[PDB]
Amino acid sequence: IKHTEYMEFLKSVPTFQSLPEEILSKLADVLEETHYENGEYIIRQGARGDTFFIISKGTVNVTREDEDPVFLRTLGKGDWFGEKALQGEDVRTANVIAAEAVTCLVIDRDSFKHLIGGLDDVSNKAY
Numbered sequence: 001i002k003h004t005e006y007m008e009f010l011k012s013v014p015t016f017q018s019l020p021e022e023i024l025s026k027l028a029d030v031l032e033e034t035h036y037e038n039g040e041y042i043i044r045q046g047a048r049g050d051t052f053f054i055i056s057k058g059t060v061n062v063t064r065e066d067e068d069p070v071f072l073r074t075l076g077k078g079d080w081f082g083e084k085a086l087q088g089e090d091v092r093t094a095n096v097i098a099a100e101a102v103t104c105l106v107i108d109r110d111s112f113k114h115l116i117g118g119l120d121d122v123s124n125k126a127y
Ligand SMILES: Nc1ncnc2c1ncn2[C@@H]1O[C@@H]2COP(=O)(O)O[C@H]2[C@H]1O
Pocket: 043, 049, 062, 072, 073, 080, 081, 082, 083, 084, 085, 086, 091, 092, 093, 094, 095, 096, 127
């Protein structure tokens, strides 16, 4: 049941909407569904990371020391984050904190580097 749910969800995300269905299937098989509550750190700035996150429920706040924290933006269902530590250096460039009950579909580096990393929408992500 979860497998089909994951594939339908991934398809609905514009970044992933055009992937071959077998690649979507592989992603659905390797991802880990992870749950957070309000105020829980998902990512800390300056940590070293190896995971990519797709939000399937809730919202998160992104902040950065750029010594007090500054608010960058809020991300929500269908948005994703954590790609910068998978591009070149592995350092996290911002904090990501749950703003309510959150579900993320988590993709590790082993799968990301084959199935997602070649996507321009991810590799050339502007901000
Ligand atoms: N200015 C910003 N606005 C929104 N998201 C950001 C910003 N800077 C970094 N991020 C996201 O926060 C993530 C923190 O970990 P990564 O650097 O791996 O990937 C980062 C991006 O997904």
